[PDB]
């Protein structure tokens, strides 16, 4: 019944037993955000000397898989998620441990990808080129790079009017905008 | 008399508290929680309880029993979850697990987001203008004459939009 | 009337625990010899008790799952071809069927057949044109439309619309 | 020189039988199948042989030696297999993997699925029919009036078909 | 009591990176004299307290990104699997200070973000002209690779012609 704490109670290197798969990290990493459950470890908390085991690991009834990204964040202040981990189980772990900074960023991600699908795609831009027939072949083959043919449409077919008169063709052409 | 319980699930070991293995008291797991003299021999030398089931699927099961949510990693197949939910007898989860299966099954739809349309009208003079100026999201499908000889039309013109 | 219940497998390095009884679902399979406690494999047992098996464990999961619950559970990363080979070596006829249905299921899914279309020509005068196109039922896409004279009564326009047949 | 042999590729143990490692006698591994006096420093406490390489990619290789097939999990990089194949020197497997890599590279590059076209003809009355009764797989492209105000043709109508 | 450890004067070096043990040879870690690792390579005294109860040196970083690092060293080539986050490697490269790696790791991060290639693979366009009678023919005896686009009528009520016809062709 605690006479005093245990020889490792302040060690540099701390062993966590996050739900089964043991983790390794330096006590001081845990002192990054001083409102987290884990900040207790950082400060030698004597309430934890019954949730430590045989190896002197700290125990944690939570999911080792999801924990990683968290422990990394504490290590360098960055969000790392492999492409198969499910970000919501990262949220649930961010809350449980209580890392106010992180939780903001996870829920940023969660929107960022519910955004990522949402779009109206490729804001196409259109242009109406006009020419006579005598240069139709020309106008079509000498379009600019990237632009596509959408439609063209006659404007009067069956000889002219007088010693002058309106062009003869339109042509609408498009381009992407990625 | 320990708060903690080790589980040898198919081979790999799992750590968790007596407290988490009784959130649903009809389950198999509940007996462990209850310090049962009928699952004593099903412990190994290091103390764990032995459980002839694949663990890679037993993950999400144990998470639910912790925070009451469903957490499935993109690659893990739901169908393998369900079997473990049903083997362990955790009805509330099974409900959730079959809702995921119906959830993502119905996504085979090649049934697209319905395009709405509009039929614009303008004269020749403001046609180039009309086209280039075109508002946000609207694509161009076709235009047509109404004869280039009382206003009525000079040109008509169709255009589409997505509505997801 | 003995009950030596549990047994450890050293499949390819990574251990496995499963009950004697699980390994007696297909009595024509290699694993049935482990189940009967065969003296001819006492020298394929290491120190820790387990049975040595010179095969890939990443794929031996699905195979052992079938013998627990009689179903085919395959994660999306694991390639089914590897489940087949293991299924053959261990010799689980029932399973070798199931695994070979999966492959033909999927390796004939990647064959992408053109979508069929149904096509109709409507016909609507100028006034009621706008109305026609913007009201269209679900699925029906636009295709073309043509003036029939652009200038008595008749019909003013026609129009082709179309719809997937998935 | 027993029967069973333990490796230790990159710090994650492998188990296999002498017999699997003699398949190719011009590969590094072959020395571990004979019982080499000069690869006995590189044994550890557990008796296993030590190998400074990456055990992710080593699996496939070791598989090929057991049953002569190139099995790969979908996520893993073939380029990493190639490289581990080469190191160990299995000329058979380097060929199989350099097949796999050519087999899927330049995947995203098809010869332009050629198109064949027709030009259907009809009159006022059967118009609706011609379109509504179109052969399997042909697509609509364009239709044309021929002078709308003793019979002749009234409507000409182009149509395509993909040739996969 | 004898003399020395059947395994002290050893080529082999155990790391306990973030909690999952890695094995490698002294000769491997030394590939870049500038890196953090180069020190454990050379059995540094200012690290003899980051070793554990069984000889492996300790590193507070994430193994699941380490891998690639320890590979590049072994064989001077960048390997990452399709599911690992390329960004997370950059950090583990920058912490260890492997300069040649950090030029590669970033070049891949460009390489695939630098790949919105909706870049319209080009099309050349032509304008054909044929009468009514030989209008079915043109369309079908049309050359290899060309597609149809649109066609436009020219005056229905002298031999010349009666229809234009636009037709595309891809430029792969």
Curated annotation (Swiss-Prot), chains B, D:
It is found in: Cytoplasm, Cytosol; Cytoplasm; Nucleus. Residues 3-105 form the BTB domain. One of its GO terms (cellular component) is nucleus. GO terms for molecular function: cullin family protein binding; identical protein binding; protein-containing complex binding. Its main location: cytoplasm. Coiled coil: none annotated. It comes from the Eukaryota. The keyword Cytoplasm applies. Induction: Up-regulated in peripheral blood lymphocytes stimulated through the T-cell receptor. One of its GO terms (biological process) is proteasome-mediated ubiquitin-dependent protein catabolic process. The keyword Acetylation applies. Keywords: Acetylation, Cytoplasm, Host-virus interaction, Nucleus, Phosphoprotein. The BTB (POZ) domain is atypical and mediates the formation of a homopentamer instead of a homotetramer. Homopentamerization is due to the presence of 4 residues in the BTB (POZ) domain: Leu-15, Gly-59, Val-71 and Ala-77. Homopentamer. Interacts (via C-terminus) with GRASP55/GORASP2. Interacts with CUL3 and with ubiquitinated proteins. Interacts with CRY1. Its interaction with CUL3 suggests that it may act as a substrate adapter in some E3 ligase complex. Does not affect the function of Kv channel Kv2.1/KCNB1, Kv1.2/KCNA2, Kv4.2/KCND2 and Kv3.4/KCNC4. This is BTB/POZ domain-containing protein KCTD5. The gene is KCTD5. The chain holds residues 42 to 210 of 234 of the full protein.
From Swiss-Prot, chain C:
GO terms for cellular component: Cul3-RING ubiquitin ligase complex; cytoplasm; cytosol; nucleus. GO terms for biological process: proteasome-mediated ubiquitin-dependent protein catabolic process; protein homooligomerization. The lineage of its organism: Eukaryota, Metazoa, Chordata, Craniata, Vertebrata. One of its GO terms (molecular function) is protein-containing complex binding. The BTB (POZ) domain is atypical and mediates the formation of a homopentamer instead of a homotetramer. Homopentamerization is due to the presence of 4 residues in the BTB (POZ) domain: Leu-17, Gly-61, Val-73 and Ala-79. It is found in: Cytoplasm, Cytosol; Cytoplasm; Nucleus. Keywords: Acetylation, Cytoplasm, Host-virus interaction, Nucleus, Phosphoprotein. It comes from Homo sapiens (Human). Induction: Up-regulated in peripheral blood lymphocytes stimulated through the T-cell receptor. It comes from the Eukaryota. This is BTB/POZ domain-containing protein KCTD5. The gene is KCTD5. Homopentamer. Interacts (via C-terminus) with GRASP55/GORASP2. Interacts with CUL3 and with ubiquitinated proteins. Interacts with CRY1. (Microbial infection) Interacts with adeno-associated virus 2 (AAV-2) REP proteins. Its interaction with CUL3 suggests that it may act as a substrate adapter in some E3 ligase complex. Does not affect the function of Kv channel Kv2.1/KCNB1, Kv1.2/KCNA2, Kv4.2/KCND2 and Kv3.4/KCNC4. The chain holds residues 40 to 210 of 234 of the full protein. Residues 5-107 form the BTB domain.
């Amino acid at each position: 019944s605690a006479l005093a704490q245990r020889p490792g109670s302040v060690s540099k290197w701390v062993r966590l037993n996050v739900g089964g798969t043991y983790f390794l990290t330096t006590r001081q990493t845990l002192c990054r955000d001083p409102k987290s459950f884990l900040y207790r470890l950082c400060q030698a908390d004597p309430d934890l000397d019954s949730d430590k085991d045989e190896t002197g690991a700290y125990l944690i009834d939570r999911d080792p898989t999801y924990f990683g990204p968290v422990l990394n964040y504490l290590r360098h202040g960055k969000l790392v998620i492999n492409k198969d981990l499910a970000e919501e189980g990262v949220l649930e772990e961010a809350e449980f441990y209580n890392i106010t900074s992180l939780i903001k960023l996870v829920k940023d991600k969660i929107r960022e990808r519910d955004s990522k699908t949402s779009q109206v795609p490729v804001k196409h831009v259109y242009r109406v080129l006009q020419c006579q027939e005598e240069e139709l072949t020309q106008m079509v083959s000498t379009m600019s790079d990237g632009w596509k043919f959408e439609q063209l449409v006659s404007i009067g077919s069956s000889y002219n009017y007088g010693n002058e008169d309106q062009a003869e063709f339109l042509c609408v052409v498009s381009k992407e905008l990625h």
